[PDB]
Structure formats: structure tokens, C-alpha cells
Design a protein around this ligand. Sequence first.
Ligand SMILES: Cc1cc2nc3c(=O)[nH]c(=O)nc-3n(C[C@H](O)[C@H](O)[C@H](O)COP(=O)(O)OP(=O)(O)OC[C@H]3O[C@@H](n4cnc5c(N)ncnc54)[C@H](O)[C@@H]3O)c2cc1C
Length: 257
Amino acid sequence: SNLYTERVLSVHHWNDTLFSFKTTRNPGLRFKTGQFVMIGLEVDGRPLMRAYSIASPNYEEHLEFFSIKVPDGPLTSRLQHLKEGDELMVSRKPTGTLVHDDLLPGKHLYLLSTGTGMAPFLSVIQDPETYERYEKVILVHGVRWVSELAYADFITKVLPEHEYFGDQVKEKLIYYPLVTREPFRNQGRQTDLMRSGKLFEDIGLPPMNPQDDRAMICGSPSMLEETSAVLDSFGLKISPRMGEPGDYLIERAFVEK
Ligand SMILES: Cc1cc2nc3c(=O)[nH]c(=O)nc-3n(C[C@H](O)[C@H](O)[C@H](O)COP(=O)(O)OP(=O)(O)OC[C@H]3O[C@@H](n4cnc5c(N)ncnc54)[C@H](O)[C@@H]3O)c2cc1C
């Protein structure tokens, strides 16, 4: 059918509610950094499909997904059991609002995420175009528990040594993990820390302004609303719709069903 059937190459569990996996990628699946695609499994005679951000670089011939594990979630109660060699259905045309083209030129790119909302941003931080367009890239990953800080080693130790753009990562990428419920070097919610100015002080950058700062926001619908309001308070204006460049972009990491 119009769905690709890919094969699982590797799986890694981060904790009780998070895991990632890599699959083969059909050469016909083209995507812009930041986009999502429908993926799923055949259940009771029908594909059980859900939107997933593509977490792998768009120039590499494989796909990677960073996923939640919902106890009785229709798709993830099954997806959590993926093993090497298993089949995964993937749709043909990715889409989404978190693309480079919809941000006006600027100096800093803030990637504001909570939970699995960091997924599209994993693609962004591995995209040479990101470093071509910005002086600084700030990946904020807000979670509740330290164990939810998936990809910590990749972001802080592996990516900076990248053979082709590791030096750009060292010079430009700032990683600001945040944890609310356990002791952690950076405590709190990113929205609160931005409103007080503490987030910027911690990372060594000036407060945001509409001329220099751009952002992509990915988290729960409530998180998007609250974070959008914070950026609006600094004078930034959201892209009004896909295709119309603005100061920041937003996309729901999931929906409360
Ligand atoms: C544009 C878009 C991109 C998405 N990208 C991803 C992604 O990269 N990774 C991913 O894991 N999910 C992502 N999601 C959510 C995903 O589509 C499914 O909701 C997820 O795979 C759970 O399916 P389910 O069938 O198990 O549970 P569902 O019935 O879908 O959802 C059950 C409940 O789980 C919670 N839930 C679902 N997904 C999440 C989540 N990711 N984090 C926290 N709580 C959640 C909610 O309380 C929800 O009501 C995305 C959603 C959208 C709209």
C-alpha cells in the first residue's frame, strides 16, 4: 500500500516511559529537518498509525524515533516491544511546522522542548544548515525526572566530536537540560526561568529580542500556550501559518486524548 514497511535496526530504552529506535529508510522518503511522519503497526487488520517527529538527520539513510511508552496506549503498548528485525509502517509524505524556512533570519535559535518534544530537535542539532544560519543554538530539554534526560551522552559527548561539524557544535550548541522533581544542576520550568531572566543568565546569552532571537517550541498543548506567551512578552511574533516566516514556530509534541 501507500505505506512503506521499514525494518528495525536497533532499539534503546532510556527509562520506564522512554525509548528510541532506528529503522531502515526508503530513498523515496524525503523530509525537511523538523518534520514528522505517520508510523505504526498492523493491528487487528488495520494499521494503527500515529504522528512521530523524525529524530534522525535528513541526509542519513535510516530513520530514528524517540518515543513515549504509554501503559495502555494503543500504539505504544505494542511499540515498546520492538526488536531488531521487526516491521514498522511509515507514511510517504512528511509534513510539519518546525522547519528552517519559516524562521526569519536571526542570530540565536532556541529549541524549547519538554519530554519527547525534543525529538524533532535531535534532527535540528545534527543539521549543518542549523549551524549555517545561527551564531548560537540553544537546546532546552525540560523534564520531571533526571532519567528522562534521554540522549544526554550523545548531545554532550558524541555530537561535539562529529567528524564534519563537531567544531560547529562545540562553538555554537548550548545544552540546557532542566529537571523539576529531583536534585539537578538546572532546576525548574523553562517558562519560569525565561520570565525571570535566569535561563539566559545561566547560559551566558542576553535577554531575547525580536531582532536577534528565533525559536521552535515543541511540548504539550499547555506548554505551547505558556511558552508562546513568554516569547510574546519579549516582542517575538509567531509565524502565522506554515509557509509564512516569523520569529518562532510551534508544534504539539502530543495531544491529550
Ligand atoms: C505532530 C505530532 C508529533 C508527534 N511526535 C511524537 C514523537 O516524536 N514521539 C512520541 O513519543 N510521540 C509523538 N507524538 C504523539 C504520538 O502521535 C502518539 O500520541 C504516541 O505515539 C502515543 O500513542 P498511543 O497510541 O500509545 O497513545 P495515545 O492514545 O495516542 O495517547 C494516550 C495518552 O498518552 C499521553 N501521550 C501520548 N503521546 C505522548 C508523548 N509523546 N509524551 C507524553 N504523553 C503522551 C496523553 O496523555 C494521551 O492522551 C506526536 C504527536 C503529534 C500530533
